[PDB]
Design an enzyme around this catalytic site. Sequence first.
Site, PDB file in Angstrom:
ATOM      1  N   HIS A   1      -5.703   7.461  -3.219  1.00 34.32           N
ATOM      2  CA  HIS A   1      -6.776   6.546  -2.737  1.00 34.32           C
ATOM      3  C   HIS A   1      -6.312   5.741  -1.518  1.00 34.32           C
ATOM      4  O   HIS A   1      -7.205   5.278  -0.778  1.00 34.32           O
ATOM      5  CB  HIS A   1      -7.314   5.635  -3.853  1.00 34.32           C
ATOM      6  CG  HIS A   1      -6.475   4.426  -4.068  1.00 34.32           C
ATOM      7  ND1 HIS A   1      -5.360   4.453  -4.859  1.00 34.32           N
ATOM      8  CD2 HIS A   1      -6.540   3.186  -3.537  1.00 34.32           C
ATOM      9  CE1 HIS A   1      -4.791   3.257  -4.849  1.00 34.32           C
ATOM     10  NE2 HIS A   1      -5.489   2.468  -4.050  1.00 34.32           N
ATOM     11  N   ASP A   2      -5.001   5.587  -1.299  1.00 38.11           N
ATOM     12  CA  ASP A   2      -4.469   4.846  -0.121  1.00 38.11           C
ATOM     13  C   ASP A   2      -3.548   5.731   0.723  1.00 38.11           C
ATOM     14  O   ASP A   2      -2.670   5.162   1.397  1.00 38.11           O
ATOM     15  CB  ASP A   2      -3.736   3.578  -0.565  1.00 38.11           C
ATOM     16  CG  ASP A   2      -4.624   2.356  -0.697  1.00 38.11           C
ATOM     17  OD1 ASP A   2      -5.682   2.304  -0.027  1.00 38.11           O
ATOM     18  OD2 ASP A   2      -4.227   1.440  -1.444  1.00 38.11           O
TER      19      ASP A   2
ATOM     20  N   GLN B   1      -5.057 -17.742  -3.903  1.00 42.05           N
ATOM     21  CA  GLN B   1      -5.116 -16.943  -5.153  1.00 42.05           C
ATOM     22  C   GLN B   1      -6.256 -17.461  -6.040  1.00 42.05           C
ATOM     23  O   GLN B   1      -7.053 -16.646  -6.531  1.00 42.05           O
ATOM     24  CB  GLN B   1      -3.751 -16.973  -5.846  1.00 42.05           C
ATOM     25  CG  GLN B   1      -2.736 -16.079  -5.152  1.00 42.05           C
ATOM     26  CD  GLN B   1      -3.285 -14.694  -4.929  1.00 42.05           C
ATOM     27  OE1 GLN B   1      -3.339 -13.887  -5.853  1.00 42.05           O
ATOM     28  NE2 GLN B   1      -3.748 -14.431  -3.713  1.00 42.05           N
TER      29      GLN B   1
ATOM     30  N   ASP C   1      -7.732  -0.613  -8.612  1.00 40.42           N
ATOM     31  CA  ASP C   1      -7.126  -0.968  -7.303  1.00 40.42           C
ATOM     32  C   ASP C   1      -6.515  -2.378  -7.365  1.00 40.42           C
ATOM     33  O   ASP C   1      -5.401  -2.553  -6.810  1.00 40.42           O
ATOM     34  CB  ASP C   1      -8.151  -0.813  -6.177  1.00 40.42           C
ATOM     35  CG  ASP C   1      -7.526  -0.668  -4.804  1.00 40.42           C
ATOM     36  OD1 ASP C   1      -6.356  -0.293  -4.739  1.00 40.42           O
ATOM     37  OD2 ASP C   1      -8.225  -0.923  -3.822  1.00 40.42           O
TER      38      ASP C   1
ATOM     39  N   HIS D   1       0.846  -1.223   0.000  1.00 34.48           N
ATOM     40  CA  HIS D   1       0.000   0.000   0.000  1.00 34.48           C
ATOM     41  C   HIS D   1       0.875   1.265   0.000  1.00 34.48           C
ATOM     42  O   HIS D   1       0.761   2.096   0.925  1.00 34.48           O
ATOM     43  CB  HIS D   1      -1.027  -0.087   1.123  1.00 34.48           C
ATOM     44  CG  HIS D   1      -2.041  -1.160   0.890  1.00 34.48           C
ATOM     45  ND1 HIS D   1      -1.999  -2.377   1.536  1.00 34.48           N
ATOM     46  CD2 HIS D   1      -3.134  -1.199   0.098  1.00 34.48           C
ATOM     47  CE1 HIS D   1      -3.020  -3.114   1.148  1.00 34.48           C
ATOM     48  NE2 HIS D   1      -3.733  -2.413   0.281  1.00 34.48           N
TER      49      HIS D   1
ATOM     50  N   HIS E   1       2.087   1.674  -5.713  1.00 32.53           N
ATOM     51  CA  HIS E   1       0.674   1.222  -5.837  1.00 32.53           C
ATOM     52  C   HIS E   1      -0.198   2.393  -6.327  1.00 32.53           C
ATOM     53  O   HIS E   1      -0.931   2.222  -7.324  1.00 32.53           O
ATOM     54  CB  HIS E   1       0.188   0.620  -4.507  1.00 32.53           C
ATOM     55  CG  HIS E   1      -1.272   0.303  -4.474  1.00 32.53           C
ATOM     56  ND1 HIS E   1      -1.849  -0.612  -5.323  1.00 32.53           N
ATOM     57  CD2 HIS E   1      -2.270   0.763  -3.685  1.00 32.53           C
ATOM     58  CE1 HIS E   1      -3.142  -0.690  -5.064  1.00 32.53           C
ATOM     59  NE2 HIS E   1      -3.426   0.133  -4.068  1.00 32.53           N
TER      60      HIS E   1
END
Length: 312
Positions: free
Chosen positions: A105-106, A268, A216, A67, A71
């Site tokens: 956004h983060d 995953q 994202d 994060h 990113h």
Amino acid sequence: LMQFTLPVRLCKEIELFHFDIGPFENMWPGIFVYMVHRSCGTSCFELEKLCRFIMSVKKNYRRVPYHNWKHAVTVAHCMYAILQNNHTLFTDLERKGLLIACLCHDLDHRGFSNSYLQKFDHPLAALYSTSTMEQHHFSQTVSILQLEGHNIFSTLSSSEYEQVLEIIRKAIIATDLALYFGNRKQLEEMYQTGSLNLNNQSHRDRVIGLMMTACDLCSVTKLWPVTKLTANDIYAEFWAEGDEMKKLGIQPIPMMDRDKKDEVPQGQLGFYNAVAIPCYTTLTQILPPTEPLLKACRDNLSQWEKVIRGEE
Ligand SMILES: Cn1cc(C(=O)Nc2cccc(-c3cn4ccccc4n3)c2)c(Nc2cncnc2)n1
Ligand SMILES: [Cl-]
Ligand SMILES: [Cl-]
Ligand SMILES: [Cl-]
Ligand SMILES: [Mg+2]
Ligand SMILES: [Zn+2]
């Protein structure tokens, strides 16, 4: 004018959805400005205010494994590729707002989920009861915009500034994955009944939400070598949060237990089937040119299956 230019390889490959922004951190601001200049226009922002804003945003991302500032720029580039391939569908304010939304956004992410902040009893959980980190990220965005010389929206009117901030707020809140499940379901029914209307503002809001989820998660839409290495970064964060859950005397969920490391390929598989493939499938239905994101996601799902069968 002083137009931003990229080296030949970057100029061509930045137009591809699976573009990787590279390991030279000091090129990422130039890459962002280039994307803004091409998708928005060279007159959307004063270059000096935009550069000061970019460097304040970078400084308020933390040195965490996933994060992080890399990113932020990677998500903005995914949004760039979607806007350039659907360039008739969005407004002036939407183009301006959505690249900034993605970069911010983060902001100030500590590498912990909303669940951990609630179990820890972090002050942020008292301040914002739902979408805790996402309301914090937006609050950080507004703080930076309100710094002297950082108002990149200073030429907009009062009502336009209020609209763009409302686009940014909804876009950032939508990156809360807990909200994505209900949002994609609604867009799925709306699409299948023929009721979806891109002139209905409350429908645009849902489509931009799904676009923010797709951007994202865009690390699962890269070429296999990038996707595999990036998976190590998210798990480094998940496993550190799992350690912190054990310290509170709470059993962590399996994706956050570093002892369940050998089950990553199956984890995953579940993530692609329950989250990513449906995300990019619904997005391709609404925005057909976003097909290459779905194609590259399906290719990575196949690579994880090849891992499980012990061939990779
Ligand atoms: C934002 N984000 C979330 C995920 C993600 O993988 N979540 C997730 C979701 C559901 C289950 C599992 C799951 C269950 N498990 C049980 C045992 C061991 C492991 C394990 N993982 C994991 C992600 N991944 C990613 C991959 N490659 C590149 N970039 C990002 N990015
Ligand atoms: Cl560098
Ligand atoms: Cl730090
Ligand atoms: Cl100002
Ligand atoms: Mg987030
Ligand atoms: Zn993110």
